[PDB]
């Protein structure tokens, strides 16, 4: 098992001696490495042309949050409120009150990307699969107050992307 | 009276103008369970907690509202707070009285 | 009872048991008890004064060539006549196995430093000193680490709020960052997850 | 709103102060003492976002709210007042810009501010003018500010009016100025000595005083005026300036007209001139000593002496040879009064 | 912005005299 | 029972006096080297005050423990550990005033 | 939106097989019915 | 991506990169995939399961204890000594 890195030692044979001496005086390995970077000059550059091209991702990838509707057009969220109860950063805050119809609903679902750690526990937790960690990954913004999403904001994110998200979940759920 | 107030960095305000409130917690009555009931704990008194002007969050000032500590014996708890030089409100363990039960007493007549 | 549960070898439990007996007899001026955690982890106790002599022999051969502290943990518990409860892991190499001696300590009694015995414990003395009140005697240099400068109160005291009693913020009128009491927003919502119905008949203390 | 909780960075307060032109020395400090209270503010920018940027930390998330505006459009000023409980005027300018003619700055803007303060039902309005604003032939600022003073008083009479007795601070355009007069060579004195005399107030004191003035129910229509505890002579004063800046001190006696020839020479620069004839008249006219008007101590705040605080203000002017030194070494300047 | 309306909705004195 | 340092009071009080000597003499150097603009007196007075803060402690070991925690600070200022911020921190200068008068407090906030 | 017919008890899931709300049984016919989150009432 | 260059490149390298060209992925795994179906799991039998058996956390037991000092003979090792390792076999030195 155990292996000796090094430990191997140079021969004192005169051909070898002259070789190492000529190596020192004439810099063989030096020019070797130099030739190596020469060799990497000729390979095709790895850069992608962002924005105009964008890097590969995955169906499972996590990003901006977004509550989302039934196809019926009704919202999914039902305030079982355990999204609050499982987020380690406890970013989420929820305050449900009854619908006039009598159905359970949120009044001010909110979240703040300032504290959220994008761990995707909320994505797992929801029994009705309401909140979803959306594919979008870019929403850097000027002002701190914008980070602190309101419920309406999440819905708008759910409106913007719904075909996309439904596509990911469609492509992914079997592995769940 | 092993006072250690100088050793703790705690500001004088909160070894002074507030009190601990030792008790063995009551059973949640919705529950029929008994487990969480036992073992002394050392809750502090509540102070002010207003509201965030933005987003409506319950912003809060007091340094140590959420603190709470389990114990095995009450004397140990009182002595504990005494070591801290703490004001306290010890409360009795209030075990339910044992009660007679009989399925057949339902069928007296 | 196979696929899920761990098999737990009897053998190791034997050897650790007998070895615990072995040390128990070799030096019983101080080994209060040599309990073996059933998942193969021996762990003898020590009278707090007795720290150096035990650990010393613990490096010294008989079989106890347990060189290198893995760590110097300092479990806290508000109860007990003395709250803080120090712990020493140890590892022997040739017989590849780990043990774990441990003591107890008053808030105020100065237990001696164990730096000389395990060698690589100089950093730990400073750690536990600045994460606790406990003092180690014959330590070349206790001083704060893992904190700010002033800061004062030890954390990890099992009490002591996680949000602490202070905060820095930069203040233009004086053009400088400065300490100031926490004023914390949102407040640490504190769930009480803990639930009724004891799950563990196999333990559960006598009602007394 | 009713105030809640310990005063603090998270603390609410009813104040929804609106400060105009806070980009300057005052009231960056005034916003800060609002901010330690946690009181909301709506400082609105005329200039550019960038210079305003350092204003941001002072608040607490949603507190500070920059708003675009113009002093010339009526509704533009209707914007930032629109929910303000109180509106405060700190706007001032030493050198007359072109497009803002020197008069409107001290007339029109305070005017629209005053009457809009009326229409919006603003709970309090407040305004600043130099103690020497009392009309005098030299200098058009004292007079134009007297005009807007009297105007807002005529329009929002219950407004209290600031009359500060020269504030000294690290960001000052005054003390730093005479500190920087070294750069030309000497220090132009019209005739040295008692040719004019001044008294100063710590900037910090003025700020604390203003917010305390909102903290004072009594500070209604009263025209507050701020003076520091000590009294000094301009000559001995500058003597103390180079006594703390350690720079060589050359008094430079001068016939009065030539200094104005100098001011006319230096008004030429398109940018922001170091000196101007208006400032030339800011120079030689002494502050009046009247104390009977409502003022700083009436607020209950006591002035911080300049003598311990000039050092921090001027250390940046120090040569490296002297850049570290105790203030006490310099010797407290004698007080004329 | 703030969401979920109000709290205490405290009552106020009547317009009518006495 | 093992004592930390000095047995009985007074033996420990001398320690603390020594400590005051050290702090006091060091202070002008602190104001000089740190470019602090606190009045050179004020630091001294504040030192004396901090020394008054525990001027009623009476336990045996606790006081020597107090000079242990007292050494480290001069230990830091002498090594230029801590900074202008960190050492100016003691003066609480940015705080809003908080009168201890009952009625004064009474108007301001819900209080304890 | 319009209520589905029933007679009487019947499933609901919100229509998403392992994508909808977890399965429940509404129990009405001529009466208006339900429900979980899916509004899929069974008034008929 | 031309013979005029690739030859010179490989010779400059002394490694002949063309066999790998690992610095890019010209044609790796296709992204869309057939549905998973995915494994059931060992205990999913309905015919015989009892959690009283399968449970592991209930097998937790209080630590075995010895001495409790609080309340010939022969010497012995904690464990038999481990053997010295064999030296790598195929590549004894590096
Ligand atoms: C008739 C006879 C007349 C004379 C005939 C004989 C000629 C005499 C022998 C010629 C030798 C001249 C070579 C120049 C001196 C070489 C010594 C130099 O390498 O010193 C070493 C230090 O090496 C140098 O610092 C190398 C660093 C230089 C970095 C630049 C790389 C140059 C890239 C190649 C450019 C070539 C362009 C020109 C080519 C025509 C120190 O040796 P040592 O301490 O014991 O261990 C390190 C051994 N090294 C060489 C493997 C590092
Ligand atoms: N020692 C002192 O300085 C004393 C001052 N005062 C008075 O108190 C006030 C505060 O002084 P201070 O803050 O130092 O002066 P500053 O110049 O520092 O403050 C004025 C600010 O208001 C802005 N401003 C005002 N009007 C306009 C306008 N029409 N368009 C664009 N910007 C405008 C200025 O430019 P911008 O915001 O665009 O950058 C500047 O930022 C002054 O008005 C002064 O007369 C009184 C006594 C002593
Ligand atoms: C410049 C500002 C930055 C530094 C500010 C000061 C730094 C000082 C840090 C504080 C360290 C301490 O105070 S340690 C404990 C001091 N000891 C006491 O307070 C003891 C109080 N008990 C007493 O009896 C005291 O009255 C006296 C003064 C010790 C009595 O003296 P005895 O007659 O010997
Ligand atoms: S899980 Fe998703 S839906 Fe159910 S409550 Fe938490 S957030 Fe609302
Ligand atoms: S994102 Fe990750 S962390 Fe933030 S809430 Fe949803 S789950 Fe909890």
> With the CA atoms of C61, C63, C67 and C72 taken in that order, what torsion angle do they form, in degrees rounded to the nearest 10?
-120
- Compute CA distances B27 → B34, B77, D254, whole Å: 6, 20, 91
Cβ contacts (< 8 Å) between G19 and chain A: which residues?
Answer: 129, 169, 173
Q: Check if the beta carbon of residue D141 is closer than 8 Å to that of residue D149.
A: no
- For D325, name the nearest residue in chain F, comparing CA atoms only: F32
φ, ψ (nearest 5 deg) of residue D41: -140, 150
In order, the DSSP letters of chain B are ----TTTS---THHHHS--B--BPPPPPSS----GGG-S-B-PBPP--B---TTTT---B--TTTT---B-S-HHHHHHHHHHTT---------PPPP----SGGGG--
For H41-59, letters b (16+ CB in 10 Å) and e give eeeeeeeeeeeeeeeeeee
Of C165, C169, C172, which to mutate for an interface test with D (greatest number of D Cβ within 10 Å)?
A: C172
Sign (positive/negative) of CA torsion D125, D131, D135, D139? negative
Nearest CA to F13 out of F69, F60, F45 is that of F60
For C151-172, letters b (16+ CB in 10 Å) and e give bbbbbbbebbbebbbbeebebb
Q: Check if the beta carbon of residue C36 is closer than 8 Å to that of residue H64.
A: yes
How many Å apart are CA D235 and CA D194, to the nearest integer? Answer: 7
Indicate the helix (H) or strand (E) that contains D167.
strand D167-168
Q: How many CA atoms lie within 13 A of C138 on its CB side?
A: 11
Q: Is D318 helix (H, G, I), strand (E, B) or coil?
A: coil
Indicate whether residue D167 lines ligand 2 (CB < 6 A). Answer: yes
How many Å apart are CA D82 and CA D85, to the nearest integer? Answer: 9
Q: Which residues pair with C92 in a beta bridge?
A: C97
Q: Please, which residues have CB within 8 angstroms of residue C111's CB and are 6 or more apart in sequence?
A: C48, C49, C51, C86, C103, C105, C134, C135, C136, C137
φ, ψ (nearest 5 deg) of residue F86: -65, -30
Q: Is D251 helix (H, G, I), strand (E, B) or coil?
A: strand
Q: Check if the beta carbon of residue D200 is closer than 8 Å to that of residue D306.
A: yes
How many Å apart are CA D107 and CA F23, to the nearest integer? Answer: 58
How many Å apart are CA B81 and CA B95, to the nearest integer? Answer: 24
* Interchain contact E6–B (C-beta under 8 A): no
Indicate whether residue A89 lines ligand 5 (CB < 6 A). Answer: yes
Largest distance between two CA atoms of chain B: 71
* Interchain contact D3–B (C-beta under 8 A): no
Q: Provide the shortest C-alpha distance from residue F56 to chain D (in Å).
A: 30
How many Å apart are CA H91 and CA D216, to the nearest integer? Answer: 88
Pairing assessment for the beta strands D86-89 and D124-128 based on DSSP bridges: parallel
Burial (Cβ within 10 Å: 0-12, 13-18, ≥19) of residue D17: buried
How many Å apart are CA D241 and CA D246, to the nearest integer? Answer: 8
Q: Check if the beta carbon of residue D218 is closer than 8 Å to that of residue D299.
A: no
Nearest CA to D279 out of D68, D138, D76 is that of D138
In order, the DSSP letters of chain C are --SSS----HHHHHHHHHHHHHHHHH-TTT---EEEETTTEEEEB--GGGHHHHHHHHHSSSS----SEEEEEEE--SSSSS-BEEEEEEEETTTTEEEEEE--B-SS--EEP-HHHHSTTHHHHHHHHHHSS--EET-S-----SS-SS--S-S-SSSS-TT-S-EEEEETTTTEEEEE----SS---------SS-S-TTS-----
Structure-block tokens of residue A138: 């870019």
**Number of neighbouring beta carbons within 10 Å of residue D269:** 12
* Interchain contact E5–B (C-beta under 8 A): no
Q: Is D82 helix (H, G, I), strand (E, B) or coil?
A: coil
Task: Characterise C5 by phi-psi region: left (phi > 0), alpha (psi -120 to 50), beta (else).
Answer: beta
Q: Check if the beta carbon of residue A127 is closer than 8 Å to that of residue A112.
A: no
How many Å apart are CA B85 and CA B79, to the nearest integer? Answer: 9
Atom of ligand 1 nearest to the CA of A26: 13
For D245-263, letters b (16+ CB in 10 Å) and e give bbbeeeeeebeeeebeebb
Nearest CA to A104 out of B56, E5, B29, G21 is that of G21
> Helices A162-172 and A151-160: crossing angle, nearest 10°?
80
How many Å apart are CA D148 and CA D130, to the nearest integer? Answer: 12
Q: Is D240 helix (H, G, I), strand (E, B) or coil?
A: helix
Nearest CA to D103 out of D63, D78, D73, D139 is that of D139
Nearest CA to B50 out of E1, F94, D2 is that of D2
How many Å apart are CA D248 and CA H65, to the nearest integer? Answer: 85
Peptide bond into A51 cis (omega under 30): yes
Nearest CA to D96 out of D286, D284, D280 is that of D280
Q: Which residues pair with C84 in a beta bridge?
A: C105
Chains F and H touch (3+ CB pairs under 8 A): no
Q: Check if the beta carbon of residue A89 is closer than 8 Å to that of residue C188.
A: no
Q: Report the separation in Å between the CA atom of F18 and the middle of ligand 3, taken as the mean of its atom positions.
A: 10
How many Å apart are CA B73 and CA C79, to the nearest integer? Answer: 8
- Compute CA distances D199 → B66, D139, D166, D337, H49, whole Å: 53, 19, 7, 10, 93
Q: Check if the beta carbon of residue C13 is closer than 8 Å to that of residue H65.
A: no
Q: Which residues pair with C169 in a beta bridge?
A: C178
Q: H23-28 — which CB contacts under 8 Å span 24+ positions?
A: H23/A40, H23/A43, H23/A44, H23/A46, H24/A43, H24/A44, H24/A46
Q: Check if the beta carbon of residue D208 is closer than 8 Å to that of residue D301.
A: yes
For B7-32, letters b (16+ CB in 10 Å) and e give bbbbeeebbeebebbbbbeeeeeeee
DSSP code for D313: H
How many Å apart are CA C114 and CA D194, to the nearest integer? Answer: 75
DSSP code for G31: S
What is the separation, in whole angstroms, between the first and last Cα of chain B?
A: 64
How many Å apart are CA D9 and CA C181, to the nearest integer? Answer: 9
Nearest CA to H51 out of H43, H41, H39, H60 is that of H43
CB contact under 8 A, A39 and H93: no
Q: G30-38 — which CB contacts under 8 Å span 24+ positions?
A: G32/G3, G33/G3, G33/G6, G36/A78, G36/G12, G37/A70, G37/A74, G37/A76, G37/A78, G37/A103, G37/A128, G38/A70, G38/A72, G38/A74, G38/G12, G38/G13, G38/G14
CB contact under 8 A, A150 and E3: yes
Structure-block tokens of residue A61: 């990838």
Residue matched to tokens 């960001």: D171
> What is the separation of C-alpha C186 from the centre of its chain, rounded to a whole number of angstroms?
33
Q: Is G10 helix (H, G, I), strand (E, B) or coil?
A: strand
Q: Check if the beta carbon of residue D90 is closer than 8 Å to that of residue D19.
A: yes
**Number of neighbouring beta carbons within 10 Å of residue A141:** 9
CB contact under 8 A, C31 and H63: no
Domain ranges of chain F: 1-112
What length does chain B have?
Answer: 109
Burial (Cβ within 10 Å: 0-12, 13-18, ≥19) of residue D153: middle
Resolved by: cryo-EM
How many Å apart are CA C90 and CA C126, to the nearest integer? Answer: 19
How many Å apart are CA A136 and CA A43, to the nearest integer? Answer: 33
Burial (Cβ within 10 Å: 0-12, 13-18, ≥19) of residue C103: buried
φ, ψ (nearest 5 deg) of residue F15: -60, -50
Q: Is D275 helix (H, G, I), strand (E, B) or coil?
A: coil
Q: Check if the beta carbon of residue C185 is closer than 8 Å to that of residue B52.
A: yes
> Helices F60-78 and F13-33: crossing angle, nearest 10°?
20
Cβ contacts (< 8 Å) between A90 and chain C: which residues?
Answer: 189
* Interchain contact F26–C (C-beta under 8 A): no
How many Å apart are CA A107 and CA G27, to the nearest integer? Answer: 29
No. of helices (H) and no. of strands (E), chain E: 0, 0
φ, ψ (nearest 5 deg) of residue D74: -65, -50
CB contact under 8 A, B61 and D62: no
Q: Check if the beta carbon of residue A123 is closer than 8 Å to that of residue A133.
A: yes
Indicate whether residue A92 lines ligand 4 (CB < 6 A). Answer: no
Structure-block tokens of residue B35: 């487990």
Sign (positive/negative) of CA torsion D142, D145, D149, D155? positive
> What is the separation of C-alpha D210 from the centre of its chain, rounded to a whole number of angstroms?
12
Pocket of ligand 3 (CB under 6 A): F 13, 16-17, 23, 27, 43, 46-47, 50-51, 54-55, 57, 66-67, 70, 73, 87, 90
What is the C-alpha radius of gyration for chain C, rounded to an integer number of angstroms?
22
Q: C52-56 — which CB contacts under 8 Å span 24+ positions?
A: C52/C112, C52/C114, C52/C116, C52/C117, C54/C27, C54/C30, C54/C101, C55/C88, C55/C90, C55/C101, C55/C114, C55/C117, C55/C118, C56/C117
CB contact under 8 A, D6 and B50: no
> Helices D277-284 and D140-155: crossing angle, nearest 10°?
90
Sign (positive/negative) of CA torsion F96, F97, F100, F102? negative
Structure-block tokens of residue D297: 């101590």
Of C165, C171, C173, C188, which to mutate for an interface test with D (greatest number of D Cβ within 10 Å)?
A: C173
Q: Is A115 helix (H, G, I), strand (E, B) or coil?
A: coil
How many Å apart are CA D113 and CA D151, to the nearest integer? Answer: 11
- Give the angle H10-H15-H16 at the CA atoms, nearest 5°: 40
Indicate whether residue A112 lines ligand 5 (CB < 6 A). Answer: no
Sign (positive/negative) of CA torsion A120, A125, A131, A135? positive
Indicate the helix (H) or strand (E) that contains D161.
strand D160-164
Q: Check if the beta carbon of residue C1 is closer than 8 Å to that of residue H54.
A: yes
Nearest CA to D311 out of D211, D244, D265 is that of D244
Q: Please, which residues have CB within 8 angstroms of residue A93's CB and are 6 or more apart in sequence?
A: A84, A108, A109, A110, A111, B55, B57, C186
Q: Check if the beta carbon of residue G36 is closer than 8 Å to that of residue G24.
A: yes
Q: Is D80 helix (H, G, I), strand (E, B) or coil?
A: helix
**Number of neighbouring beta carbons within 10 Å of residue D190:** 18
Nearest CA to G16 out of A170, C20, D149 is that of A170
Burial (Cβ within 10 Å: 0-12, 13-18, ≥19) of residue G3: middle
What length does chain G have?
Answer: 44
Cβ contacts (< 8 Å) between F32 and chain D: which residues?
Answer: 324, 326
Cβ contacts (< 8 Å) between F73 and chain B: which residues?
Answer: none
φ, ψ (nearest 5 deg) of residue C15: -65, -40
What is the separation, in whole angstroms, between the first and last Cα of chain F?
A: 40
Indicate whether residue D107 lines ligand 2 (CB < 6 A). Answer: no
Query: What SS3 string covers A12-81?
Result: CCHHHHHHHHHHHHHCHHHHHHHHHHHHHHCCCCCCCCCCCCCCCCCCCCCCCECCCECCCCCECCCCCC
Cβ contacts (< 8 Å) between G16 and chain A: which residues?
Answer: 129
- For D307, name the nearest residue in chain F, comparing CA atoms only: F39
Q: Report the separation in Å between the CA atom of F10 and the middle of ligand 3, taken as the mean of its atom positions.
A: 13
How many Å apart are CA D20 and CA D221, to the nearest integer? Answer: 20
């Amino acid at each position: 098992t155990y292996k000796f890195v090094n430990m191997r030692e140079p021969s004192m044979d005169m051909k070898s001696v002259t070789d190492r001496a000529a190596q020192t005086l004439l810099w063989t390995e030096l020019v070797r490495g130099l030739g190596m970077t020469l060799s990497y000059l000729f390979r095709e550059p790895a850069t992608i042309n962002y924005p105009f091209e964008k890097g590969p991702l995955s169906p499972r990838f996590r990003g901006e949050h977004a509550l989302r509707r039934y196809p019926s057009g009704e919202e999914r969220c039902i305030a079982c409120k355990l999204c609050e109860a499982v987020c380690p950063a406890q970013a989420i805050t929820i305050e449900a009150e009854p619908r006039a119809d009598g159905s359970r609903r949120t009044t001010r679902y909110d979240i703040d990307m300032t504290k959220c750690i994008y761990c995707g526990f909320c994505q797992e937790a929801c029994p009705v699969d309401a909140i979803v960690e959306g594919p979008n990954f870019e929403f850097s913004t000027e002002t701190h107050e914008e980070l602190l999403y309101n419920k309406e904001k999440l819905l708008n994110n759910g409106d913007k992307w719904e075909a996309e998200i439904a596509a990911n979940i469609q492509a992914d759920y079997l592995y769940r | 009276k092993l006072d250690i107030t100088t050793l703790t960095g705690v500001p004088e305000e909160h070894i002074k103008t507030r009190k601990v409130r030792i008790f063995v917690p009551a059973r949640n009555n919705m529950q029929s369970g008994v487990n969480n009931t036992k073992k002394w704990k050392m809750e502090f008194d509540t102070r002010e907690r207003w509201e965030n002007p933005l987003m409506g969050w319950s912003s809060t000032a007091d340094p140590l509202s959420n603190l709470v500590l389990t114990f095995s014996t009450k004397e140990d708890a009182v002595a504990f707070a005494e070591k801290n030089g703490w004001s306290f409100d010890v409360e009795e363990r209030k075990v339910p009285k044992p009660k007679s039960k009989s399925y057949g007493a339902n069928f007296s007549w | 009872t196979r696929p899920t549960i761990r098999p737990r070898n009897d053998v190791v439990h034997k050897q650790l048991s007998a070895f615990g007996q072995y040390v128990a007899e070799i030096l019983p001026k101080y080994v209060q008890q040599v309990q073996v955690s059933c998942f193969n982890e021996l762990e003898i106790f020590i009278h707090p004064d007795g720290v150096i002599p035990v650990l010393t022999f613990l490096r010294d051969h008989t079989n106890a060539q347990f060189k290198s502290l893995a760590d110097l943990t300092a479990v806290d518990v508000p109860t007990r006549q003395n709250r803080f409860e120090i712990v020493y892991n140890l590892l022997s190499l040739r017989f590849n196995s780990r043990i774990r001696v441990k003591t107890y300590t008053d808030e105020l009694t100065p237990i001696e430093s164990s730096v000389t015995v395990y060698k690589a414990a100089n950093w730990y003395e400073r750690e536990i000193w600045d994460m606790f009140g406990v003092f180690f005697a014959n330590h070349p240099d206790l001083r704060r680490i893992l904190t700010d400068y002033g800061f004062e109160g030890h954390p990890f005291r099992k009490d002591f709020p996680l949000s602490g009693y202070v905060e820095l913020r930069y203040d233009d009128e004086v053009k400088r960052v400065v300490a100031e009491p926490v004023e914390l927003a949102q407040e640490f919502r504190k769930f009480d997850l803990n639930s009724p119905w004891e799950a563990f008949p196999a333990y559960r203390q006598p009602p007394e | 709103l009713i105030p809640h909780g310990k005063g603090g960075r998270s603390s609410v307060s009813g104040i929804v102060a609106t400060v105009f032109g806070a980009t300057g020395f005052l009231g960056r400090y005034v916003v800060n003492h609002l901010g330690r209270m946690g009181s909301q503010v709506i400082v609105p920018y005329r200039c550019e976002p960038y210079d305003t940027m350092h204003l941001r930390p002072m608040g607490d998330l949603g507190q500070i709210i920059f708003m675009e505006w113009n002093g010339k459009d009526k509704d533009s000023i209707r914007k930032v007042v629109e929910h303000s409980n109180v509106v405060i005027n700190l706007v001032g300018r030493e050198w007359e810009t072109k497009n803002f003619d020197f008069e409107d700055v001290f007339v029109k803007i305070p005017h629209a501010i005053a009457q809009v303060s009326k229409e919006a039902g603003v709970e309090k309005l407040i305004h600043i003018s130099h103690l020497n604003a009392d009309i005098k032939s030299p200098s058009r600022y004292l007079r134009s500010k007297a005009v807007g003073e009297k105007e807002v008083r005529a329009a929002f009479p219950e407004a209290t009016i600031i009359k500060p007795s020269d504030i000294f601070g690290r960001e000052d355009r005054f003390l730093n100025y005479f500190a920087s007069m070294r750069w030309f060579g000497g220090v132009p004195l019209i005739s040295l000595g008692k040719e004019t005399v001044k008294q100063p107030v710590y900037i910090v004191d003025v700020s604390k005083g203003i917010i305390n003035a909102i903290k004072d129910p009594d500070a209604k229509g009263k025209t507050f005026a701020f003076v520091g505890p000590n009294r000094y002579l301009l000559f001995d004063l500058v003597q103390y300036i180079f006594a703390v800046a350690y720079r060589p001190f050359l008094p430079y006696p001068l016939p009065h007209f030539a200094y104005r020839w100098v001011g006319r020479l230096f008004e030429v620069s398109p940018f922001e001139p170091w000196t101007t004839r208006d400032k030339v008249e800011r120079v030689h006219m002494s502050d009046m000593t009247l104390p009977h008007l409502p003022g700083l101590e009436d607020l209950g705040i006591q002035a911080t002496p300049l003598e311990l605080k000039a050092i921090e203000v001027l250390r940046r002017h120090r040569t490296y040879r002297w850049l570290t030194s105790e203030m006490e070494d310099v010797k407290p300047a004698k007080t004329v009064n | 912005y703030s969401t979920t309306r109000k709290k205490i909705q405290e009552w106020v004195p009547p317009s009518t005299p006495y | 029972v093992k004592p930390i340092f000095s047995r009985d009071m007074n033996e420990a009080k001398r320690r603390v006096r020594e400590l005051y000597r050290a702090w006091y003499r060091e202070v002008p150097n602190t104001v000089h080297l740190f470019q602090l603009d606190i009045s050179v007196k004020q630091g001294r007075d504040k030192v004396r005050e901090m020394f008054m803060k525990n001027a009623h402690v009476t336990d045996p070991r606790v006081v020597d423990l107090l000079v242990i925690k007292g050494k480290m600070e001069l230990e830091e200022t002498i090594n230029v550990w801590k900074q202008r911020t960190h050492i100016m921190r003691f003066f609480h200068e940015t705080e809003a005033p908080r009168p201890t008068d009952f009625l004064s407090k009474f108007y301001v906030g819900h209080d304890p | 939106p319009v209520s589905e017919v029933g007679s009487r008890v019947i499933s609901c899931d919100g229509g998403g097989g392992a994508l909808g709300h977890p399965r429940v049984y509404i129990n009405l016919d001529k009466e208006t019915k339900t429900g979980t989150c899916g509004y899929c009432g069974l008034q008929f | 991506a031309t013979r005029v260059i690739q030859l010179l490149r490989n010779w400059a390298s002394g490694r002949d990169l063309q066999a790998k060209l690992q610095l890019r992925y010209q044609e790796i795994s296709k992204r869309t995939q057939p549905p998973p179906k995915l494994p059931v799991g060992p205990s999913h039998k309905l015919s015989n399961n009892y959690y009283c058996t399968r449970d592991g956390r209930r097998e937790a037991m209080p630590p075995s204890i010895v001495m409790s000092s609080q309340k010939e003979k022969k010497a012995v090792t904690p464990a038999p000594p481990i053997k010295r390792w064999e030296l790598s076999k195929d590549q004894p030195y590096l």
